């Protein structure tokens, strides 16, 4: 409506799909399916299954790098998406691969004072939009976040345009970059 | 550090944003940016200012945004918009903005983000008395 | 990455954010100005009493919302500096004891800039009354 | 104490005890106890002395993530201590146990230049209102501080009223909080 | 976060920190638009060599205060984003050179701002003179 | 010669080797062989060459921590460069010799988007204002730097009569504060 007789209220909404070929783009599918692109080629998709895809608790991160298969903006949206996660004390609990240039990534998930708190908490930061139908505890959950899912699953994929129930959104990855090394334990004496 | 990045008046290419419309802004609105912190309109503008002139003055990395996010964007207002959602507060993902369209003479204030809530954009009148604070603001036009 | 926190209630000090004192309720030109001004520390502790309040209230014993957010609710470079201050053994600030100028005809209120320390003791008003006598000589220029 | 006929001085001691519960408030006791109070009935205990208790050089860190019996707070806490030391090299210092969920650790010290300038100025920062007395001299050095004491005990305590001398401030913690990797020397040449 | 340091009081340049002049003095005044803006290079290096006036003076190798101090002195942003235009052909700045348009009667001096490079060379007043224009108009709309 | 009547444009330059003490300054004399300086009589070269001086790919850095001899700032500096390298992924391509308080660091940099990408980027990032000449990369090419040289070399000097082709800049330096640890490829799960 008309405020004051002459300042009328007119939106506009940015196209924020137009930053496609600069930086990183994460938008949802559905409460599980979360994807993140990082050009119009490629990019990663992160969903909370109760099946794994990875059955050994090995990760070969310096093979893979020695190797060096893998696209690098992906190992580096994964790797600031395992430095941004707080408290992470259990080294059992994630899982990769990267066989042949792959980048598949599980966390395990199986309360409060958790890992489970961290890894849904770097999830939401992440894929925004989505957060509303992936997280089970609604609204006002903060320390004891944590979802019925089993797995955090991280792969690799194309676009196949599935971004639905959210606008492309860079927000979450961007707004997360500086969330990098705030929080992390020191696990030895020399750093 | 702050965010330094200066915008090469201001307006908006169809591409960058939905109905097809130039919503060429005025120089008084360009001119709140560079003072102004905590609005998140001028935050998108920088955004896509960049995106514009890394497109058409270089020949896929995310290394350049790594570089560039602190000196584009105030991280801490999207962290703050964070904070808003965690808290059950009403926040801004960045999506929608509104403006005071002054229809006499075109001129039109900085827009501000529509607060979202609960999946939803937000009902105009509820924050109604901050669109009053806008108008009586842009009265004060000398 | 600056501050961006805002302040809702012309914010008031409640009884439990200050020691053996009343309520201290400042006018709206002072979280306007703290709105602007980056260089000032109680404007920082507004928004972490603010920040707590809504802690409490809004949230329901970790330290991790905090860890996160200590970028947003501090300017993060005013202990920096209050430190530098005080390595080098010039007056600094440690956050507490806020003085301001208070208008007893109209009850207007100034932004309460910090009470500077030195020598481990509270710095006297003599040493630092010019800047009292500036902050008045901005203030007349307020009316 | 009236100024220019026009205003008048006053003055706002604030109380930092009301910020216990969302962030560490950070206190002295004297010259050698300082201490950190985590909300309630939890803290740490930062205490110079000659007398060690820990008298191995093992820091049993990622058996201690492995056993997750600590607390998260407190660990974070040791975590932005260690990492805020502008330059440590020196491995054998630091020795650390936390069976049992217990924490402690033990910064040893013995012309200048060396890692117990580190330790004394995050030491400082930390216990950042009133701990100038620790020193024989305490200005006119900050890039040479020595202390007549041997160790820097960390230790984990219960809330009594250890607070004296200065008052509880959160000003130190929130200022070793944004340093905490700002000067790290590099150990290894994959990160 | 946000830069914070504040000047000394005399604070202006001198011998030991120009090339060819002796004593190039501003007046001290209306030079707090450097603690509003935040885009300025000169302000940056006015704050760094303040600080070294004060780290010669106040305390005695080690870079280690440098490194404590950089957040707190300099927009560490404002480089970054020079540097940005440095990858482009854009002109940019090198923090070296600065020019400030001086008042003939009273003598009253604008903040200095960074003379462009480009090319390996510092710009023509050609495609830059309409800057010191825009400045002029800002010195003639001050009353 | 006045802009508007009543102005006069008056140019500034600025010393900045006044700040030779307190902070490190960055300087260029040659296509090769650039230079920074912690103060006086102490700085580091940056040897930009095609022919090796050390063909050991061990580095043994931790060992230099052990015997602490190596200048802090020295090492400082080494660390702020080697933490500073965009997506650094082959240890391999990487060698060092510190042998009593030597410092010595190698960068070898024998496609588009390599390790030897990131190091000239940080290369020219630490000395700008004089690295133009040094890599033959244009204006629109900063994704992937191509230099014909093949091997870049960090090691201490005394502070000789150097800075000939650019003046002296701590720019470089300060920007590089902000960019440790921003950018680092996760090699362990517990970090
Ligand atoms: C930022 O960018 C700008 C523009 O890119 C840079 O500005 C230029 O910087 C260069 C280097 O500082 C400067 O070149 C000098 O010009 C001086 C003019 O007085 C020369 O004196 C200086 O050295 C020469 O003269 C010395 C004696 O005074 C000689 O001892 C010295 O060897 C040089 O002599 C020349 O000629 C003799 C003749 O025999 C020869 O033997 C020598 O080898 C040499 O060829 C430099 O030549 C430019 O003048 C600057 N341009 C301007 C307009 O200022 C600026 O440096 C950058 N700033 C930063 C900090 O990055
Ligand atoms: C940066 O490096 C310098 C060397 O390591 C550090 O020392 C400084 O050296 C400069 C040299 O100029 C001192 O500046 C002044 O030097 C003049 C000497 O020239 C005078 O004499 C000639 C001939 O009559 C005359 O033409 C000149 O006008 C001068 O009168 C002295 O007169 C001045 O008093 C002054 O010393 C710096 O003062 C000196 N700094 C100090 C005190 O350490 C320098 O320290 C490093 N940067 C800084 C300043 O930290
Ligand atoms: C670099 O170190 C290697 C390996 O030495 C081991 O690791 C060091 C960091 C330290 O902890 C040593 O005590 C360890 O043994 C050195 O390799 C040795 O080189 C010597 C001399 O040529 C040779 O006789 C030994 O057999 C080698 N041992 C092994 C296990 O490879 C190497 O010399 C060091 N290089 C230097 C200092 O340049
Ligand atoms: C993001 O994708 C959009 C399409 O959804 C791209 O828009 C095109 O951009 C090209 C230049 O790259 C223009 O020539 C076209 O006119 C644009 N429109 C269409 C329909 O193709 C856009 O370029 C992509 N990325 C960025 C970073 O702008
Ligand atoms: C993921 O986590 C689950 C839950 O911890 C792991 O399965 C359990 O492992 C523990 C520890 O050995 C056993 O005591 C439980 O009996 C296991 N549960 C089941 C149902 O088998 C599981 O192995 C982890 N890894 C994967 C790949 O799922
Ligand atoms: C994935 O597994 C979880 C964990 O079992 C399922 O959620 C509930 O888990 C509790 C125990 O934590 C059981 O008591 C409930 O019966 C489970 N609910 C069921 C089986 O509906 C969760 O439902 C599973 N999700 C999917 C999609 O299979
Ligand atoms: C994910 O990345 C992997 C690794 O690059 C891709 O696997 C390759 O796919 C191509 C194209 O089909 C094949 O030619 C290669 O043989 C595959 N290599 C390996 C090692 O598997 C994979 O296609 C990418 N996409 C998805 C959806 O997994
Ligand atoms: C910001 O949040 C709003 C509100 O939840 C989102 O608006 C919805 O966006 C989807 C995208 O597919 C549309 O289908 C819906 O119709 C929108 N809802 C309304 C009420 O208009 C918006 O997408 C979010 N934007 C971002 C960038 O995350
Ligand atoms: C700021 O510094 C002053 C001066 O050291 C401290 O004032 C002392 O506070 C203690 C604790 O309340 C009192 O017992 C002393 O009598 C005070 N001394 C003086 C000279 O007034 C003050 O506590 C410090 N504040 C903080 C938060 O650290
Ligand atoms: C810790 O902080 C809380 C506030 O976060 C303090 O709680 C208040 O204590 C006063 C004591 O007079 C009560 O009147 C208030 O009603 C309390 N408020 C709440 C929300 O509990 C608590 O006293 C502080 N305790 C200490 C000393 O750490
Ligand atoms: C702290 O380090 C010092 C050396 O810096 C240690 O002192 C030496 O300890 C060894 C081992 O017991 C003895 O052989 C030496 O004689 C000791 N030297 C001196 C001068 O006392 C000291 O033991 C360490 N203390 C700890 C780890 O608690
Ligand atoms: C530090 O924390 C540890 C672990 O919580 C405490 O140790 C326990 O103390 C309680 C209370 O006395 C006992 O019930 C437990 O059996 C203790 N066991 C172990 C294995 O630690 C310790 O008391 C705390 N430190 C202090 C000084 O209280
Ligand atoms: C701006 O212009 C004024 C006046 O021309 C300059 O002030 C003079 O500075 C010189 C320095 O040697 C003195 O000798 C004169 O006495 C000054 N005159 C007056 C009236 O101030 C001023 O220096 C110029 N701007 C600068 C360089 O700061
Ligand atoms: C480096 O510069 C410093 C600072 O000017 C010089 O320090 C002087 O060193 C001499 C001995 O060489 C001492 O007697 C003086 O007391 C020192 N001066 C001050 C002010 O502390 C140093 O000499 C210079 N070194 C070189 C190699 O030029
Ligand atoms: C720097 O990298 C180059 C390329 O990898 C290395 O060149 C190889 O050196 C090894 C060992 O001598 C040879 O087996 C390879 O055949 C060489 N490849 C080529 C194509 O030259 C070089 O050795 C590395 N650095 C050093 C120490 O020279
Ligand atoms: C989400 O969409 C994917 C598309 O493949 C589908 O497999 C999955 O079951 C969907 N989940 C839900 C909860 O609808
Ligand atoms: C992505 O955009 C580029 C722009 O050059 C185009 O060449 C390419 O075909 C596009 N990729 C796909 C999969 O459509
Ligand atoms: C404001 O309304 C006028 C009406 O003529 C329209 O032309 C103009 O584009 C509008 N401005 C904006 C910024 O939407
Ligand atoms: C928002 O609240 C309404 C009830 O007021 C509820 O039906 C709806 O599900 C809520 N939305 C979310 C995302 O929790
Ligand atoms: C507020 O939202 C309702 C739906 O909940 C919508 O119909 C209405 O138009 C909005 N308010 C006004 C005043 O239009
Ligand atoms: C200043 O004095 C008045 C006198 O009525 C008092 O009410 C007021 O609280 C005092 N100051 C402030 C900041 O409120
Ligand atoms: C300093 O303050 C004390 C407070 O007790 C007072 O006695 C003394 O006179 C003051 N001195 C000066 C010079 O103002
Ligand atoms: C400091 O206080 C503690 C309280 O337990 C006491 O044990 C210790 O001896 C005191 N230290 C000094 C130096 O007075
Ligand atoms: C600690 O705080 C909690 C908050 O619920 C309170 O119930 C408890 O009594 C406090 N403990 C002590 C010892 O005061
Ligand atoms: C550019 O060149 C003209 C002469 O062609 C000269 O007058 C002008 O001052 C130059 N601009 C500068 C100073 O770079
Ligand atoms: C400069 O480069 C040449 C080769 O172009 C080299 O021979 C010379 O040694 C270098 N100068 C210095 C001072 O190192």
Redesign the interface.
Same mark, same amino acid.
């Given at each position: 409506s008309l !405020?004051?007789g002459? !300042?009328? $209220? +007119?939106?506009?909404? $940015?196209?924020?799909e137009?930053?496609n070929?600069?930086?990183?783009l994460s938008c949802t599918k559905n409460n599980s399916h979360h994807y993140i692109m990082?050009?119009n080629?490629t990019g990663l998709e992160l969903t909370l299954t109760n099946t794994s895809i990875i059955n050994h608790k090995f990760?070969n $991160?310096?093979d893979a /790098?020695?190797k %060096?298969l893998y696209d /690098?903006?992906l190992?580096?949206?994964?790797?600031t998406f /395992?430095?941004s996660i707080? %408290?992470? %004390? +259990? !080294?059992?609990a994630?899982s990769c691969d990267f066989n042949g240039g792959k980048i598949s990534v599980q966390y395990n998930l199986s309360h409060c004072?958790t890992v489970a708190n961290g890894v849904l908490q770097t999830f939401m930061?992440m894929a =925004?939009?989505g957060?509303?139908i992936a997280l089970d505890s609604g609204?006002?959950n =903060?320390?004891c976040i944590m979802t019925s899912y089993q797995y955090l699953i991280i792969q690799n994929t194309t676009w196949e345009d599935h971004c639905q129930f959210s606008?492309p959104?860079?927000?979450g990855y961007?707004?997360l970059?500086? +969330?990098?090394?705030?929080?992390? !334990?020191?696990?030895?004496?020399?750093? | 550090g702050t965010f330094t990045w200066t915008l090469s008046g201001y307006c908006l290419t169809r591409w960058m944003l939905i109905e097809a419309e130039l919503k060429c802004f005025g120089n008084t609105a360009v001119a709140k940016c560079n003072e102004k912190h905590d609005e998140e309109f001028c935050d998108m503008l920088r955004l896509f200012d960049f995106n514009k002139q890394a497109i058409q003055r270089l020949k896929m990395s995310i290394q350049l945004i790594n570089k560039a996010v602190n000196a584009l964007i105030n991280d801490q207002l999207i962290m703050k918009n964070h904070l808003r959602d965690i808290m059950c507060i009403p926040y801004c993902n960045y999506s929608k903005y509104w403006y005071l369209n002054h229809t006499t003479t075109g001129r039109t204030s900085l827009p501000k983000c529509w607060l979202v809530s609960n999946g939803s954009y937000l009902n105009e009148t509820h924050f109604s008395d901050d669109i009053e604070q806008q108008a009586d603001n842009m009265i004060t036009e000398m």
């Open positions: !405020y004051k002459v !300042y009328e $209220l +007119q939106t506009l909404e $940015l196209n924020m137009t930053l070929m600069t930086m990183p990082v050009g080629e990760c $991160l310096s /790098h020695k %060096n /690098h903006a190992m580096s949206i994964i790797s /395992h430095l707080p %408290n992470f %004390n +259990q !080294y059992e994630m004072g930061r =925004w939009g957060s509303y609204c006002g =903060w320390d606008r959104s860079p927000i961007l707004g970059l500086s +969330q990098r090394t705030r929080d992390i !334990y020191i696990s030895r004496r020399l750093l | -």
